[PDB]
Design a protein around this nucleic acid. Sequence first.
RNA 1: AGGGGAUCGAAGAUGAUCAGAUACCGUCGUAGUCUUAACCAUAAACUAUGCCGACUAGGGAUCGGGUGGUGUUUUUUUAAUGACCCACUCGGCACCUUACGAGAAAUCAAAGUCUUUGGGUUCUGGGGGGAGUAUGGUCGCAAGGCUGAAACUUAAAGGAAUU
Lengths: 206, 96, 217, 97, 81, 25, 129, 87, 121
Amino acid sequence: SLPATFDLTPEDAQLLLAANTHLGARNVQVHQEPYVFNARPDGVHVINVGKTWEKLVLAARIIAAIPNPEDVVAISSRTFGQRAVLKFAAHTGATPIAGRFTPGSFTNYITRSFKEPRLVIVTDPRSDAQAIKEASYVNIPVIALTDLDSPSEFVDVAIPCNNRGKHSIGLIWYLLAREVLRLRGALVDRTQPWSIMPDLYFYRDP
Amino acid sequence: GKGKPRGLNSARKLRVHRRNNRWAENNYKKRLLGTAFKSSPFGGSSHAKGIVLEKLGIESKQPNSAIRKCVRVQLIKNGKKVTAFVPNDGCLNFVD
Amino acid sequence: GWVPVTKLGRLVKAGKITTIEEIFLHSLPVKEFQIIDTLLPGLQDEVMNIKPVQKQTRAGQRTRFKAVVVVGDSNGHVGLGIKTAKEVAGAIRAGIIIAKLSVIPIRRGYWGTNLGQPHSLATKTTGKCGSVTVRLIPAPRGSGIVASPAVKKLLQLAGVEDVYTQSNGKTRTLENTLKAAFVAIGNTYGFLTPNLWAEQPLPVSPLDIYSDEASAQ
Amino acid sequence: PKKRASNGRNKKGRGHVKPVRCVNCSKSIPKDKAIKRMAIRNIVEAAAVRDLSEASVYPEYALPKTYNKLHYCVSCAIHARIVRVRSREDRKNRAPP
Amino acid sequence: VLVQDLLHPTAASEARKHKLKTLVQGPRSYFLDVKCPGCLNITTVFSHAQTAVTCESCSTILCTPTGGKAKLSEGTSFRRK
Amino acid sequence: MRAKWRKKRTRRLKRKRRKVRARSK
Amino acid sequence: TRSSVLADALNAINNAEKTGKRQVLIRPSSKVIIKFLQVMQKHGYIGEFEYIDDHRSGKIVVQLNGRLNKCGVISPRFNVKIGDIEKWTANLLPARQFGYVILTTSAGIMDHEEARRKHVSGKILGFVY
Amino acid sequence: MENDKGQLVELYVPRKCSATNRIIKADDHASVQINVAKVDEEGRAIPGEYVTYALSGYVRSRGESDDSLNRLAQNDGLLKNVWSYSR
Amino acid sequence: GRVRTKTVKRASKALIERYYPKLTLDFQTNKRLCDEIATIQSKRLRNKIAGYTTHLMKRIQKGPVRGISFKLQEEERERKDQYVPEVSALDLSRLNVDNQTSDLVKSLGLKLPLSVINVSA
RNA sequence: AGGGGAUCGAAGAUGAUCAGAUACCGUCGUAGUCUUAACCAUAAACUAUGCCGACUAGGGAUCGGGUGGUGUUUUUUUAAUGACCCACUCGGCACCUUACGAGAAAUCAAAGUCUUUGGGUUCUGGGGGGAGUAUGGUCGCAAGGCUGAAACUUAAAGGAAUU
Ligand SMILES: [Mg+2]
Ligand SMILES: [Mg+2]
Ligand SMILES: [Mg+2]
Ligand SMILES: [Mg+2]
Ligand SMILES: [Mg+2]
Ligand SMILES: [Mg+2]
């Protein structure tokens, strides 16, 4: 369906390999097994970045299908994805939930942090398990940045990527932001990359 | 297989099992042993007549304090002596 | 007056939904009882149980009151609300709200041939709550609702007019009996019959078609 | 009702293990049910080590250790604050400290 | 997984599985043609021979019984089938 | 009274009954 | 021991339907299992089913379309007369309109409605809906 | 269903799980509907036309929602080779 | 026993939230500000509210205080997180791979300057 | 019924405590505790969970057997057998997570595949007491075991959880 421009370019694979997004966990769960490619000695399993890129483009095709960009919710409790989710919030509509989730944000329609969105994207099904459980009450589809050990409970679209490296978390959010800009008029030509490199999606120190 | 046999040729086992287990029922035990005909003041009848032997003042069970005004009756067809209630306000002066 | 706060409320208030069947079709969660009032104006309700529940405290028992309320028109909708409150009237009023928020559809069918309008249940169905299991069996025309008075009232408010009912467990536990019966009529659309095997083109929810008038700035 | 899945002990596959006697009261205890603590003390103290160090031949010789395995019944262990009765969820934890 | 091809599993999956638990059960054992050091006679040997198989030349041991596959006598040469 | 002391009292009572039945025979 | 291979097969299919799987393996694949599955296949309750021929007794992989609610056996195979067929369909089937009691009859293994058209009766095998 | 003279008499017709064909009930609050935007030439989302899949609450509760969505998208060409029929 | 209650604390936070430019680091003029930017029904409560406000400002000057987001420290946060570390940390520094991950690039067919390296067992 | 009888120790003795203490505590101490040849046949003999068979979810560890590493130990030129490591597999004692599913709940991978009720088969229960009593039979040297009522009496007894 998608043309040849919708493929893993060498420069896209350059960023994924340089950000260690292909380094999976050492304990693969049975649901994340289709993303295992010749598990490496020293224990680390290697993620199929081609299968990752296909999932990331499909995730974008769901994100760039909600008519109103504001009621797309992107969630990252962990500090590594905190700046990535906020920059994703700035570039797109994407009302962010960075830090604590405040239980009762998808239910409990009277809270200040109440949101009633069409789609939630969480950086971690383990660290954002409250939001996923919350989404299961009000029919919210979920896209989760999943490693090979993170659970796939109520996760419709899992993106197989490393969850430990701050480079990996910032890049996947940056790549997801680029594609949803690409499938719209903000980034009219797909072959041309942005004017700003990915390192503003990375958690900085101190 | 939930206990009981399910064989198509196990009717005897199921019939004897029900026959033996029906003896745990009070009405079946009472009827088949014939306790009403044998160990009962009446002889299995609804009513029985008898001669009054004495008037009794039965102190009611707690938590009720009263006197129930019963009588001692010796049945005619048995000779068994039983206690009977006089069921209305007064009416013990009628019995004699 | 009512000011909506949810997307479903703000979109029902604008008149973009005129029937409750769309919400049932797209499984949309209902959070405001005003949505049920707007879409089902003729929703008669009868309180069915008032019992006092006591919580022991150092200075005597603190007594509240639990109200069981069933809402529903006689055309395929029922709701069941359980609510405890200090006051009897407050428990009834808040129980009416929860019963309206629990409004579900029932499937009505024919015991035999499909002559006329549906009069019974499409299939047998069972619901369980606690030890109480309520089984509902399709009945021919003129049989009436063969049920206990509590189960009968829920089914009269369902629109079904011909049913056979079988029950088990401690049926005197009224809240569990009605909840078990409410689950059985909820499961009636859960069953898949051959006349529902034909595939459908999966319609898009109204929350995206009419998404311009949701969550206004 | 049942309090513990491991009924009160560590015995699944045996039927009988062996009785051991409590140190404090000499109650017969199944060996797996007994609360067992290893007793490792210095031969002297924490404060008299220096006192023996300058009052002994063979300077800094060994400072030996005293070794003992203590077997307690349930009541003696509880009374001596060895196991310290826990909550219903916290008693499922099997970690030593 | 709720969707998989029970008629065409991967050959690696069936290799890991037990010999009785494959789609069609079959032996994982084989037969061997052994070259005894003394001469050039061929004695067919089962992989799990479970007995001290002998030729007519080296009449001591051509394989050693074990709990599983037989242990060929440390000086021989063998080929499968 | 636990069942076993009720059991012990009944067992001792039973062999008082079959001891007095021994004299009567 | 394995008393009813048909009960083993239908239990495997029920557990596969409940878990949402679209396939299930069946061992050891008797003729009754093949005949029972063909009635299911005829009425759309299952999809394809293939028979692995090992030389022992065969294996079956059935393709499940998700349209089947329950398929049990009635053990023992009670003798069913023409008048008793309606009593069995009332007890086991959810509705009068759909579902089928499967019978083994000298005319062949068939559902209860086909048994009425041929006016035959025999022993009951199971049910499907 | 329908009565004798046609005229379908049924409150509504329920959706089905695109993975397991189960009926999505009105109380199935874990069930979701996934809309994927169809893409024209030179990569635009075409706002309005979607490829839609429905996943029931049970499949997502059991964790196979990702794998089921991988299969349905691959069957419709939305994914190329991520999903494998054999394991 | 001098722990300020929620009435003092919530009013002090709400005051700094919308009046940070007007305020200072002196309670003597902070108390005067309170009467003419807020309605306090007593002088003792005003001194408590203004006193904790000055204590809040003394903490704000040396590092931020969580829960208070006035104007000035907000736009400082956008000018700081807008920083991107030059052009590095993903640009090539000369891309090292193992044999297994090099096979990904082979299986995808892509041609990149890969360098297979030996890892410890 | 013989042997043996150190220790502890129903009985018993004695010193304390206590209002009393024929209990706990202390000190002795017969039978017993050990064994041989016979009896007994009972335990909270328990997982309070019959046996056989099939299926339904994830994980790590462990015991025994096996299979494969161009693995380590014997790093001594391409380095036996055991020991260990890694990946599988069969069988076993168990465990952890979750609750598909079940349950009244506690909880449970069986206590699941149960009103959508049927894989095969054995045994047992029918409110609480009276009562495992009386009587009869049978076994036993005895203690007792197995079997096993009725009259009568009663509105609860009981299970799990909440405050
Ligand atoms: Mg207790
Ligand atoms: Mg024992
Ligand atoms: Mg016993
Ligand atoms: Mg027992
Ligand atoms: Mg074992
Ligand atoms: Mg009784």
